[PDB]
Amino acid sequence: ALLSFERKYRVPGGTLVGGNLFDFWVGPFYVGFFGVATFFFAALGIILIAWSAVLQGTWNPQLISVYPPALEYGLGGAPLAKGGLWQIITICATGAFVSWALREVEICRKLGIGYHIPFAFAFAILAYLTLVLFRPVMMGAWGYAFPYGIWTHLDWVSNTGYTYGNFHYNPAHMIAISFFFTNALALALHGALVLSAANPEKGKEMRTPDHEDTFFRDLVGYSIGTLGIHRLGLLLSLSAVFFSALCMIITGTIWFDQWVDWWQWWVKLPWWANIPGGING
Amino acid sequence: AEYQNIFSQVQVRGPADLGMTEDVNLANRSGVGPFSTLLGWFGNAQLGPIYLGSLGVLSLFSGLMWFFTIGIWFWYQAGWNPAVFLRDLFFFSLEPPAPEYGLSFAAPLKEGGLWLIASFFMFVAVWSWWGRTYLRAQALGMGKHTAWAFLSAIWLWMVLGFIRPILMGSWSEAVPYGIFSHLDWTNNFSLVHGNLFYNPFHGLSIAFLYGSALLFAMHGATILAVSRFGGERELEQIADRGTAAERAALFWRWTMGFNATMEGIHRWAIWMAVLVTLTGGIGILLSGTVVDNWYVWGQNHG
Amino acid sequence: DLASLAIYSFWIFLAGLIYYLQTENMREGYPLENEDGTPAANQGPFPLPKPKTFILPHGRGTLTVPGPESEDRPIALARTAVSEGFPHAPTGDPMKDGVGPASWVARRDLPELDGHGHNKIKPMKAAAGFHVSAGKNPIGLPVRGCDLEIAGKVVDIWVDIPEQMARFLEVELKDGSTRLLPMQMVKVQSNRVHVNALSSDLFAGIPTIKSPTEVTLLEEDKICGYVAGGLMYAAPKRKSV
């Protein structure tokens, strides 16, 4: 079925691979060569998870868990029941995500729009690959990757964090958190602002972007503007994920001790290092 | 490369924009500030004007007093030595009164009282600033969505600092003012409550925090992707749908099988964000008042 | 248990909220249609919301949504298959007919107004006190298409007054008439403005504006559509670079 205004845009073209061969829709969904690729990788992934369920002996989705090769395996392959499936499901996952980004590129080409979305998405994929591929490879084993389970991956988060003390003290992690909170601040403000203009006090006319600038100037002395705010949300959210990837890629590799202790470089700068008093003298 | 519209290629400037008047009391608006060519590559170059009536002066003043109350305590912790102040700045902490003082104000200045003064000033700064988000909207005839949204953030803050401490019977349960000390507090809060990963409201809050990043990445990327058809002019696209709004919908429809409108994506947005601190506030409020241990709770409640 | 009661209530609330949000997002484009533009049989489990009305400023009317959806323009496309879900081929020139990525919507044929009722976008020459403040000034630069041939010269920037930003370049053609190019589709370089989307032979076909010191919402859509359409439809003439 189509949106009222949709037919004019469903023209041939924009595919990256295979010409017209997969240039069609199923309901609302665009297919394309990367739709077929995503489906293949997803499907195989889900079947393999389902088989892992069988070998763990559960079907409960709060219990199903696919764990990577134990550290003894290094960067080699492992048997299906003992780490192998995870390795294959990770390949399938990566294939499905990257296929999803490339399908998005095909949809952009057909619609004549910029590629900002798949580009954005590629940061999420990079965060994922940091955790399951780059970080394991640099650390020397697939076992450092997180297991695929609803709760077990939370276990991995907590265990991984506490290996380095209170993970709060990872400085890249502080920057990452800051971007996440600031992004949520900006999302609230942005939604609220456009809606406050689109939905003014009862009986009144819609307000103008000029009212939106004025509101923020009256409130904080500055307005970033309608273009700026969309640039900002994109930057905050991508910066959040960039610093997330960063804060993990450095951990277990360039830094592996208690993160609290990293901060001593500052306290031991030689001018103030030996001055008595304060907390650290 | 295609131009991507992350930074502007050419900046233009005109007469300073002094803003809409509606019912605003113009006596209380500053003149315009300077223009920043640097900000201008990314957003608006113009700084100011700002509105500052009596509620604004109160909030600013009270906010500054909060900041000086902590500052003076830190300088004292530093033995009045600026070398030591910079060195140990992240280690200083203004701590609430000991458990023994309950909810009283009887604690010595050096051992609780200054924390109470600081919290007093912060309470006044935030609430008056809240009133200012409502009133500035009112003066322009706009809806009150910002003040409602801001109230969700105030909720989490009110819970950590005031409501939960009151319900537990002591100011000692509130958060210290300090960079490292408040992180330590956060860690300790989770340990002592059986691991906050087992709090369903904490899981929700994460879902929304991550989701806010998902959503603003999607939405910002989208508006930028259709900026070649005027997409960022959202109010007018609301009032008179254009090919920007249609291509944006259809990108998402073709990708994930459903889509938004130009007004409605802003409703997904306000809620995704606001639910971070709403659910987060519930989760903290219930911790130690009703549930001492989330792992335990979990074992008895799915 | 009060936590159990809280979490169970929250899920009920979130389900209601998602329902409400989805219905709000069906104020445009619904009911869903068949490829022939009649109402589809399956609309989904979400109903259309109750209509809302926006009172538009400057005597410009209201907008009530949802309402009767109509393209209000002919769509030069035809089916390429005997069943649902395949592309629809342009029946003439998709750039002139405005289909595919060259599509435009039939927005109001008036200009967007600002807070004070003045045209939001004006040529900089007509915008009191506006000037280029930083960046390469493009006025006077030759404009190059993706066939690497000169299509014309920049004669002004059209600026958004209330937002103080460049929105179009006004480009003069061989015959002395001008066209608007979206600023998002040009690359201002030290010695030229490069336009990847269009080869030089396609510039004359950019939709013109009926008054030279203002653009209407409808005209913006035709220009922006046409220019974006070139990424697909001028690809044969698009040299490597």
Ligand code: BCL
């Ligand atoms: C005890 C726990 C430690 C701790 C240990 C860790 C560890 C360990 C990690 C973090 C990481 C993060 N922590 Mg920390 N952290 C702690 C305390 C906190 C606090 C807090 C308030 O105290 C906060 C706010 C944060 C915040 C954060 C973020 C900066 C970052 C998580 C987001 C991320 O990486 O996204 C990136 C996004 C993704 C990975 C999503 C990828 C999605 C993919 C591409 C798509 C999937 C599709 C899906 C399968 C689709 C299904 C089908 C459809 C739904 C239909 N931490 C405590 C002190 N933290 C993580 C990080 O930085 O990772 C890089 C990390 O590994």
Ligand code: BCL
């Ligand atoms: C990012 C840093 C850590 C991490 C830290 C945490 C912490 C801490 C928490 C979660 C939580 C969640 N995480 Mg995790 N999580 C990580 C990596 C992932 C990946 C991945 C492929 O990289 C996925 C798919 C998930 C998925 C999830 C969800 C089960 C849950 C809600 C997230 C959410 O709403 O996000 C935002 C996205 C949306 C709102 C869009 C919808 C996404 C839906 C919900 C995803 C469904 C996933 C599905 C169950 C997975 C299987 C796919 C099928 C086989 C097809 N996480 C890495 C290891 N995650 C929370 C939880 O409650 O866990 C129980 C929680 O507290």
Ligand code: BCL
């Ligand atoms: C070891 C640490 C514990 C833990 C302990 C806690 C605790 C304790 C809390 C959280 C909370 C949260 N944690 Mg946790 N958390 C852990 C692990 C994680 C991980 C992870 C990947 O491991 C993640 C992603 C998170 C993520 C999250 C968030 C979803 C949530 C906070 C939301 C927010 O916006 O707050 C930030 C927003 C605010 C604080 C609102 C503030 C608003 C006020 C009004 C602003 C005043 C401004 C002031 C005047 C200064 C102004 C200066 C200006 C420039 C003028 N946690 C581990 C398990 N987490 C919070 C929560 O809700 O939990 C349920 C909370 O209390």
Ligand SMILES: CC[C@H]1c2cc3[nH]c4c(c3C)C(=O)[C@H](C(=O)OC)c4c3nc(cc4[nH]c(cc(n2)[C@@H]1C)c(C(C)=O)c4C)[C@@H](C)[C@@H]3CCC(=O)OC/C=C(\C)CCC[C@H](C)CCC[C@H](C)CCCC(C)C
């Ligand atoms: C970079 C900034 C943020 C971001 C951006 C972003 N995400 C995106 C996009 C963008 C721009 C899209 O365009 C794309 C989209 O379509 O969204 C609707 C997407 C997307 N982000 C998604 C999720 C998601 N994003 C997240 C994060 C973020 N996304 C960042 C915070 C997170 C987390 C945990 O925070 C999640 C869970 C999906 C909704 C969607 C991508 C859908 C997709 O790739 O579909 C194809 C794959 C399948 C249908 C299933 C694959 C099945 C696998 C083969 C098996 C499962 C393996 C998996 C590793 C198991 C995990 C178990 C868990 C319990 C841990």
Ligand SMILES: CC[C@H]1c2cc3[nH]c4c(c3C)C(=O)[C@H](C(=O)OC)c4c3nc(cc4[nH]c(cc(n2)[C@@H]1C)c(C(C)=O)c4C)[C@@H](C)[C@@H]3CCC(=O)OC/C=C(\C)CCC[C@H](C)CCC[C@H](C)CCCC(C)C
């Ligand atoms: C809904 C969830 C999210 C959220 C929402 C939210 N926050 C909000 C709002 C909303 C909707 C507002 O409307 C309000 C706002 O005004 O935003 C602009 C606010 C706000 N959120 C704020 C902060 C904040 N929000 C946060 C979080 C969140 N906010 C959540 C993630 C966080 C954290 C910890 O994550 C912080 C720190 C403030 C920016 C603003 C509330 C302002 C306030 O209450 O101020 C009172 C205090 C003062 C007035 C003291 C000010 C002192 C000045 C800095 C003096 C300047 C003088 C001079 C310039 C000095 C020279 C030196 C300088 C260079 C330093």
Ligand SMILES: CCCCCCCCCCCCCCCC(=O)OC[C@H](COP(=O)(O)OC[C@H](O)CO)OC(=O)CCCCCCC[C@H](Br)[C@@H](Br)CCCCCCCC
């Ligand atoms: C959100 C929490 C913090 C918010 C930030 C608040 C920052 C406070 C800024 C301090 C402003 C000081 C104002 C002094 C004004 C003054 O002395 O007189 C104004 C004087 C003359 O005015 P006039 O004679 O016209 O007086 C009024 C007249 O009678 C009626 O028209 O002119 C000026 O001084 C102008 C000064 C420029 C003001 C611009 C301030 C810009 C602020 Br700092 C912006 Br850059 C802050 C951005 C913060 C954004 C934070 C959001 C976080 C997400």
Ligand SMILES: CCCCCCCCCCCC[N+](C)(C)[O-]
């Ligand atoms: C008890 C309620 C207060 C909420 C917690 C506030 C802690 C934030 C840390 C502020 C640090 C002090 N200072 C001056 C360095 O910013």
Ligand SMILES: CCCCCCCCCCCC[N+](C)(C)[O-]
């Ligand atoms: C936050 C989780 C994602 C929300 C999912 C909302 C479901 C969308 C319903 C799609 C219905 C599409 N339809 C048939 C109306 O076109």
Ligand SMILES: [Cl-]
């Ligand atoms: Cl500057």
